[PDB]
Design an enzyme around this catalytic site. Structure first.
Site: not given
Ligand SMILES: N#Cc1cc(=O)[nH]c(=O)n1[C@@H]1O[C@H](COP(=O)(O)O)[C@@H](O)[C@H]1O
Ligand SMILES: N#Cc1cc(=O)[nH]c(=O)n1[C@@H]1O[C@H](COP(=O)(O)O)[C@@H](O)[C@H]1O
Lengths: 257, 257
Positions: B90, B92, B95
């Site tokens: 999980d 998620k 990026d």
């Molecule tokens: N912070 C951030 C994140 C969010 C976003 O909206 N756009 C991005 O490019 N990034 C991050 O910034 C860097 C962009 O690098 P570059 O300048 O594209 O090589 C990456 O590490 C990327 O994961």
């Molecule tokens: N999958 C997922 C994720 C997304 C979401 O929308 N709601 C959640 O609870 N989770 C995950 O499911 C588990 C929920 O656990 P609990 O049943 O609240 O103890 C957690 O590991 C949480 O990070």
């Protein structure tokens, strides 16, 4: 009226992490954050040392480091303190509150033990911030909320962006600003950091899109540019970081008048 | 028309990972995913062994394991094969594509090497899926897209949810379904997994909300319940898992007719 970074560092409601960052930006004449997207500890530390004088911040993705250890982070902190830059771990926390708190404090990375700043997506609702701040506040840390993204097809637009700004305003003891493409808050206590920056027009073939330092700092009102490949892929990384620093700094000066 | 898991395992457009899952669900009479939110590898493995027969899937947060090693994951894979369940990290991913591909393949966790399934947020646009696909496609991995969230204030609603479904439909060679609170697609090749499930009403103090297995599987049309604390906080985690398995399975039998 636009305040200098040095003046913003002294605002009554400024967060201490933001104040430290703003002071060093003014001192060093840099609003450049280096995105150090490397797979080896030795490369991370080499870039931090060589380029530290030119940057206000080093952005890490610790989950790409093949040989991460906490000793590597102790050493990175030594470099940060010597050259004067903050450490921003680009973790993009995006889970429920109960989970992000553990992801931030614990596991192998122990991110809160070394990152001045982290970031979070606002998609889960405000519990993401509440969970992080339980760890971050005792450790004197700050958080950036992702209000917009640079990539093609980003859904962080419109009412989503507005929700991010409201979340930041309601959690200003821990949230110090935004990842965004432009200024999204009129409150000068918030920082705006903008990724997707290169001198030249373009993108990559996995949806990254680029705008220039002059566009994002000068026309769009952001504070800091985040640059990765624009520097790291250059033949001369020292000269490239200086080109980006000078671009972002003069764009800021012009806006300030 | 409501199809059985076993029938869906044979649908023409079904991904091999989805088929494997649906077949073991049918065989074992389980549509329970254990959310193994623990910090010690010994506890994770003891839960995986004891609860393995009762579950179709084990969901991990590897970044909260204090003593992660790839040897722990080797032992988890052994238990998954022994007891017949899939491993879902999980993570998620949320990026840009160029980054997520490294986060999935590399670093200390090498997530693609052991996780059958991962999930991604759709907020960055489809680059997130493209980046993961470059790594996961030849490994016969699948991805789930987060179309809705269980937490208070979730922004994964409306046009956001619709975007997630479109993206899944456009990337069905790799995307095998959704994290959602209810059925969001009528295409039976897609899995729906639903977190925020407990037998009892309530939530937690950091934005989590709970609905019953009967509500989520029976009324809202989801396929699989994801249960963490409802099981992990019990004295006897095996007895708790069996209660959740029976609740979820009988709810599924009920909507079948
Ligand atoms: N912070 C951030 C994140 C969010 C976003 O909206 N756009 C991005 O490019 N990034 C991050 O910034 C860097 C962009 O690098 P570059 O300048 O594209 O090589 C990456 O590490 C990327 O994961
Ligand atoms: N999958 C997922 C994720 C997304 C979401 O929308 N709601 C959640 O609870 N989770 C995950 O499911 C588990 C929920 O656990 P609990 O049943 O609240 O103890 C957690 O590991 C949480 O990070």
């Amino acid at each position: 009226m636009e305040l200098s970074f040095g003046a913003r560092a002294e605002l009554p409601r400024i967060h201490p992490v933001a104040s430290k960052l703003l002071r060093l930006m003014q001192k060093k004449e840099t609003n450049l954050c280096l995105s150090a997207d490397v797979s080896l500890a030795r490369e991370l530390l080499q870039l931090a040392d060589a380029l530290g004088p030119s940057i206000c911040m080093l952005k890490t993705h610790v989950d790409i480091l093949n040989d991460f250890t906490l000793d590597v982070m102790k050493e990175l902190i030594t470099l940060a303190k010597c050259h004067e830059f903050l450490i921003f771990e680009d973790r993009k926390f995006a889970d429920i509150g109960n989970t992000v708190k553990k992801q931030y404090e614990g596991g192998i990375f122990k991110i809160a033990s070394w990152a001045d700043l982290v970031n979070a997506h606002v998609v889960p609702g405000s519990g993401v911030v509440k969970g992080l701040q339980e760890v971050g506040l005792p450790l004197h840390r700050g958080c950036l909320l992702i209000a917009e993204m640079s990539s093609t097809g980003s859904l962080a637009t419109g009412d989503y962006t507005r929700a991010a700004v409201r979340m930041a305003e309601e959690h200003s003891e821990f949230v110090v600003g935004f990842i965004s493409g432009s200024r999204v808050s009129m409150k000068p206590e918030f920082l705006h950091l903008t990724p997707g920056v290169q001198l030249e027009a373009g993108g990559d073939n996995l949806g990254q899109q680029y705008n220039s330092p002059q566009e994002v700092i000068g026309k769009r009102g952001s504070d800091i540019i985040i640059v990765g490949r624009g520097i790291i892929s250059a033949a001369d990384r020292l000269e490239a970081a200086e080109m980006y620093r000078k671009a972002a700094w003069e764009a800021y000066l012009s806006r300030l008048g």
